[PDB]
Design a binder for this molecule. Structure first.
Ligand SMILES: *[C@@H]1O[C@H](CO)[C@@H](O[C@@H]2O[C@H](CO)[C@@H](O[C@@H]3O[C@H](CO)[C@@H](O)[C@H](O[C@H]4O[C@H](CO)[C@@H](O)[C@H](O)[C@@H]4O)[C@@H]3O)[C@H](O)[C@H]2NC(C)=O)[C@H](O)[C@H]1NC(C)=O
Ligand SMILES: *[C@@H]1O[C@H](CO)[C@@H](O)[C@H](O)[C@H]1NC(C)=O
Lengths: 36, 47
């Protein structure tokens, strides 16, 4: 999944927006959620 | 918070500082002026 910071691999992009958990850059944040 | 659609602020005009929906970026008039008046470098968006 391409992002402004760079290529993100192993994570799934979701439409839904939540609070930032692990910042990445350019407003993208990663988090562990539901399986999981 | 978001300002209500009606702008009955007792005669005060905040149009030049509130967001302008017309532009793609929601920056206001003065924010756009500042951004244009500052010359940046190396945006870093995969150059
Ligand atoms: C609160 O905010 C502002 C404070 O003055 C003001 O509303 C607008 O102010 C600007 C002044 O820069 C006015 O713009 C001018 O209006 C004249 C007469 O209509 C026109 O010649 C121009 O407007 C046109 O400009 C462009 C074309 O040249 C286009 O963007 C478009 O076709 C415009 O019609 C000139 O720029 C503007 O008229 C007012 N508009 C309104 C609704 O007031 C006013 O004090 C308060 N305005 C609001 C919405 O609360
Ligand atoms: C996220 O938004 C795009 C644009 O509508 C949409 O096509 C996509 O399906 C959405 N993501 C998911 C998992 O549905």
């Amino acid at each position: 999944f391409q992002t402004r910071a760079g290529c993100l691999i192993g994570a799934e992009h979701v439409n839904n927006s939540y609070e930032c958990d692990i910042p990445i850059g350019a407003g993208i944040c990663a988090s562990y959620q539901t399986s999981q | 918070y978001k300002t209500p659609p009606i702008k009955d602020f007792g005669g005060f005009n905040f149009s030049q500082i509130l967001p302008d929906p017309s532009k793609p970026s929601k920056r206001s008039f003065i924010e756009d002026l500042l951004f244009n008046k500052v010359t940046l470098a190396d945006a870093g968006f995969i150059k």
